[PDB]
Amino acid sequence: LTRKTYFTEKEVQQWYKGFIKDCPSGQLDAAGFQKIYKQFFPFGDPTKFATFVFNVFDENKDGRIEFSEFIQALSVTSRGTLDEKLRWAFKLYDLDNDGYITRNEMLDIVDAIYQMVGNTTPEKRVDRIFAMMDKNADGKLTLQEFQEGSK
Ligand SMILES: [Ca+2]
Ligand SMILES: [Ca+2]
Ligand SMILES: [Ca+2]
């Protein structure tokens, strides 16, 4: 009985039917996630990125994606406003969950993105956007620095 999500509730209904359709156990864990990413990027190694994305999906950090976490992710990512979408992206970068994005963290992401695709540089690229987004130049990005930098 969500409705705390951009879905109608003859929409939660399909998404659940689809959920137990894909994953009948009702719990897809890191391993399953990791392999479908292997299918999603068969010209690279999605392992690093697959993990960062899985970590944002699994909000209570138990190592499983329940429906609540799956259906909220979809809502935000597919239908939420730009801020809400950027807030979700922010969590992905913020690996240690301390509320900032640092240079090596963002480098890690760019490195993950670079690794997942890479046969068909991260360093110079991150310096570019961080210098761009980091207005006060403290070496950290706040959500606000990130949201505005992106827009
Ligand atoms: Ca969970
Ligand atoms: Ca951080
Ligand atoms: Ca800053």
From Swiss-Prot:
Main subcellular location of this protein, as a coarse class: Golgi
One Gene Ontology molecular-function label: calcium-dependent protein kinase inhibitor activity
Any one GO BP annotation for this protein: regulation of neuron projection development
UniProt region (Ancestral calcium site 1), positions on chain: 21-32
One GO CC term on file: dense core granule
Membrane topology: Lipid-anchor
Keyword presence, NAD: no
Cell compartments where the protein resides: Golgi apparatus; Postsynaptic density; Cytoplasm, Perinuclear region; Cytoplasm
Assembly with partners or alone: Monomer. Interacts with KCND2. Interacts in a calcium-independent manner with PI4KB, but only if myristoylated. This binding competes with CALN2/CABP7 binding to PI4KB. Interacts in a calcium-dependent manner with PICK1 (via AH domain). Interacts with ARF1, ARF3, ARF5 and ARF6. Interacts with IL1RAPL1. Interacts with RIC8A; interaction is favored in the absence of Ca(2+) and myristoylation of NCS1 is not required.
Miscellaneous comment as given in the Swiss-Prot or TrEMBL entry: Fourfold reduction in calcium affinity for NCS1/FREQ in the presence of magnesium.
Name of the protein in its database record: Neuronal calcium sensor 1
Originating organism: Rattus norvegicus
First-to-last residue of the parent protein present: 16 to 174 of 190
